[PDB]
Amino acid sequence: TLLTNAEEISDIAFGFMGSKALFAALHHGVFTCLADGPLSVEEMAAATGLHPDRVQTLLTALASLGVVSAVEGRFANSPAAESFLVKGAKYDFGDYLRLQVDRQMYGLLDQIEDAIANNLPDDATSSYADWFSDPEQAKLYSNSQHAGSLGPARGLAKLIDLSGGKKLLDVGGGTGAFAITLCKAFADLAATIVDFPNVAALGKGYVEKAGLSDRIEYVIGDALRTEWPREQDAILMSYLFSGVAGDEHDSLLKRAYDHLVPGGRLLIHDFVVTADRTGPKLAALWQLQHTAFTPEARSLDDEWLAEQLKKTGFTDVKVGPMIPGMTMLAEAVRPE
Amino acid sequence: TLLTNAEEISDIAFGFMGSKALFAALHHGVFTCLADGPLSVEEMAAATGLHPDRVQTLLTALASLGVVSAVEGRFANSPAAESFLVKGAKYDFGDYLRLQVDRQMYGLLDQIEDAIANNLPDDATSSYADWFSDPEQAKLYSNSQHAGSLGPARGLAKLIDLSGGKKLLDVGGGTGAFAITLCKAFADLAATIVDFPNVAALGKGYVEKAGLSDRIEYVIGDALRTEWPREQDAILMSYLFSGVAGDEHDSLLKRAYDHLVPGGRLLIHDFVVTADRTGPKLAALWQLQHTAFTPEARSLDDEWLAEQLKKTGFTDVKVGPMIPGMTMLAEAVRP
Numbered sequence: 001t002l003l004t005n006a007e008e009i010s011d012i013a014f015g016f017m018g019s020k021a022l023f024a025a026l027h028h029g030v031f032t033c034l035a036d037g038p039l040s041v042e043e044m045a046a047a048t049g050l051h052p053d054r055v056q057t058l059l060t061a062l063a064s065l066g067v068v069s070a071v072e073g074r075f076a077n078s079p080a081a082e083s084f085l086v087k088g089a090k091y092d093f094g095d096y097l098r099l100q101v102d103r104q105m106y107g108l109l110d111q112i113e114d115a116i117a118n119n120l121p122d123d124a125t126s127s128y129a130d131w132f133s134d135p136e137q138a139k140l141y142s143n144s145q146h147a148g149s150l151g152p153a154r155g156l157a158k159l160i161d162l163s164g165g166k167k168l169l170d171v172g173g174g175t176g177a178f179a180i181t182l183c184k185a186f187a188d189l190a191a192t193i194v195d196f197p198n199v200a201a202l203g204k205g206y207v208e209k210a211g212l213s214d215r216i217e218y219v220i221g222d223a224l225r226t227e228w229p230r231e232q233d234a235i236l237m238s239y240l241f242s243g244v245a246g247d248e249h250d251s252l253l254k255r256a257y258d259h260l261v262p263g264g265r266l267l268i269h270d271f272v273v274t275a276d277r278t279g280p281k282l283a284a285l286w287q288l289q290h291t292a293f294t295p296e297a298r299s300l301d302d303e304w305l306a307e308q309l310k311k312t313g314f315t316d317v318k319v320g321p322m323i324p325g326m327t328m329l330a331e332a333v334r335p336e
Numbered sequence: 337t338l339l340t341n342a343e344e345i346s347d348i349a350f351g352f353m354g355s356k357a358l359f360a361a362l363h364h365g366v367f368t369c370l371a372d373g374p375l376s377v378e379e380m381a382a383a384t385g386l387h388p389d390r391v392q393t394l395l396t397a398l399a400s401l402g403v404v405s406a407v408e409g410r411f412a413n414s415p416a417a418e419s420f421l422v423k424g425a426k427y428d429f430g431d432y433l434r435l436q437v438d439r440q441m442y443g444l445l446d447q448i449e450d451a452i453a454n455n456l457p458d459d460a461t462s463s464y465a466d467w468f469s470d471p472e473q474a475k476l477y478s479n480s481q482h483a484g485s486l487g488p489a490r491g492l493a494k495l496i497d498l499s500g501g502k503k504l505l506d507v508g509g510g511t512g513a514f515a516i517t518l519c520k521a522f523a524d525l526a527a528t529i530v531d532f533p534n535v536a537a538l539g540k541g542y543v544e545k546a547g548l549s550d551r552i553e554y555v556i557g558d559a560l561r562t563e564w565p566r567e568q569d570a571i572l573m574s575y576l577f578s579g580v581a582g583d584e585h586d587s588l589l590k591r592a593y594d595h596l597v598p599g600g601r602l603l604i605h606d607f608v609v610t611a612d613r614t615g616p617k618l619a620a621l622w623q624l625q626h627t628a629f630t631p632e633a634r635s636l637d638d639e640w641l642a643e644q645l646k647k648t649g650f651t652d653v654k655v656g657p658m659i660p661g662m663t664m665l666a667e668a669v670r671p
């Protein structure tokens with residue numbers, strides 16, 4: 001589509017108000033209160049401890065987005081709410097949305113006006129490093145990121161095979177959602193994770209909980225300045241490229257190729273747009289979101305990625321969907 | 337319609353990114369640069385001082401929203417962008433979105449999680465009054481609001497008749513973006529804008545810079561504390577109820593009755609939702625925005641309104657649109 005109407009501009013301009021309506025409602029557990037059938041405003045005010053008038057304002061907003069129904073002054077969850085926003089639901093990501101997206105991503109995006117001009121102010125967050133140097137920000141971010149990545153990680157295990165005596169290197173593997181999931185799926189797999197000190201310290205705990213402390217080690221520090229383990233059987237880079245400066249992209253590929261045994265696989269998972277630069281929409285929006293605290297980010301597109309991987313010397317290069325409408329999986333092999 | 341799937345919820349959850357893509361682009365004159373025809377990423381960088389890789393990211397975001405087209409490594413304005421987001425377009429409104437909605441409203445909506453639980457930090461902006469203690473602040477708000485209320489003000493200069501010997505009382509008046517457009521349409525018209533000292537002073541510049549400095553007055557104070565000029569022919573209230581605590585509503589209804597000449601009309605312009613609580617969307621969202629810095633605000637519906645009016649004494653009250661899909665106009669007449 002190509003917009004023609006002022007209304008269509010308005011819808012875009014005012015989307016942030018929609019997001020915050022959804023987000024506020026999650027913070028006060030609105031959808032969970034409705035899980036047992038429709039409630040009135042005052043029935044809602046009671047269950048949530050909100051004032052009847054604020055709840056009315058919030059629910060009216062939600063209804064006008066179709067997030068809930070409003071029938072005879074009674075509110076009820078939409079099918080989407082039932083599945084995605086109720087604590088416990090099959091596809092729940094309410095906590096992901098209100099913790100990381102709302103409390104962190106929303107505010108940070110107030111920086112893009114300066115970030116896209118490569119003119120951040122001194123007091124702004126200018127990188128993951130700077131950002132995660134606050135241990136409360138590292139946690140707020142990582143807890144939701146970990147829960148959110150389990151699904152995709154389980155999706156990933158189904159695609160690739162890492163059985164046998166194999167070593168995995170996860171550059172920027174956060175708190176181990178991928179490495180842990182992979183290690184639970186493949187018996188003889190040993191993993192190494194590289195990340196920032198505050199992220200690694202939380203990671204250690206997830207790895208203990210899972211009883212994998214004997215199979216998953218952390219190598220702490222900035223991945224660009226720290227040494228990686230050599231002769232790995234596979235290397236994973238999930239949401240790394242998006243949060244790193246454009247000038248670093250080739251060297252990461254070259255380093256990766258070099259730390260891989262012959263026959264080894266490079267796996268890159270990230271927000272990637274199609275080369276026609278038309279979408280997917282969420283990949284592009286997330287790319288812009290990372291630019292806000294990564295002002296030297298370059299947009300990844302699928303054919304650049306394929307090309308650079310071949311330029312780097314990899315083979316059997318493929319790029320395709322991972323999370324539908326949002327991320328792609330690129331896959332490459334060091335010759336054997 | 338009700339949402340069912342992930343895409344539809346994501347669309348809501350990530351709408352803020354969409355909004356910011358549009359805003360960033362405006363601050364940097366993207367669409368204005370594209371007005372002379374499609375441009376490569378490189379050519380775009382030349383015209384804006386922005387770095388190529390970053391224009392590419394901004395432009396890709398926008399193309400995926402349909403705001404620009406993307407063809408052969410070139411970007412061009414969508415017809416909507418060409419019409420409404422280019423500097424000097426008959427219907428340009430890019431600066432309003434850029435300055436008020438982005439620079440101010442977006443930041444203020446971060447207070448919403450605490451505001452709907454009536455629990456703002458002392459740090460937070462907790463009312464129009466508190467907000468406008470800062471002259472720097474009162475200026476940037478009205479700057480883009482006053483110039484944005486001209487439209488609605490014109491559409492109301494086409495509607496009612498303020499002809500003859502007529503006095504006006506614009507309670508909660510702002511920098512008089514209404515009072516000004518009214519008289520200027522109606523040769524013989526008075527004026528009496530009540531408001532806040534920090535904003536008054538700005539509008540005095542707006543009236544002086546229009547030539548009306550002797551018809552329009554100002555009655556400094558907190559409309560709820562300060563007394564207004566009695567016996568008027570018309571008492572406007574635009575966006576007032578929206579940013580005032582909901583317990584001042586009924587009493588604002590009685591008060592406004594007094595200061596009119598029996599036979600004089602009252603006008604309420606504001607965000608009002610249909611009684612069934614389903615929209616319009618922009619009206620519902622704006623009430624939520626205003627609740628961010630008005631934690632005591634009440635949601636205005638069309639029925640409650642028409643209802644309480646009549647209940648206060650007014651007659652032949654008429655509640656109807658006004659800026660479709662966003663605001664309504666009430667209209668009553670004093671016995």
Ligand SMILES: C[S@@+](CC[C@H](N)C(=O)[O-])C[C@H]1O[C@@H](n2cnc3c(N)ncnc32)[C@H](O)[C@@H]1O
Pocket residue numbers: 128132145146149171172173174175177178194195196199221222223224237238239240243244
């Ligand atoms: C978006 S997150 C998600 C982590 C994980 N790979 C996943 O898929 O859930 C990116 C992670 O990479 C880390 N990271 C970013 N840049 C890094 C760098 N230069 N060196 C090491 N770690 C980095 C961040 O700390 C963050 O935890």
Ligand SMILES: C[S@@+](CC[C@H](N)C(=O)[O-])C[C@H]1O[C@@H](n2cnc3c(N)ncnc32)[C@H](O)[C@@H]1O
Pocket residue numbers: 464465468481482485508509510511513514530531532535557558559560573574575576579580
């Ligand atoms: C959303 S604005 C719009 C101004 C103008 N009436 C218009 O139609 O564009 C609300 C105005 O009313 C003022 N205001 C809000 N509450 C007020 C109060 N309790 N007393 C006096 N002025 C108030 C604000 O200063 C602001 O200028």
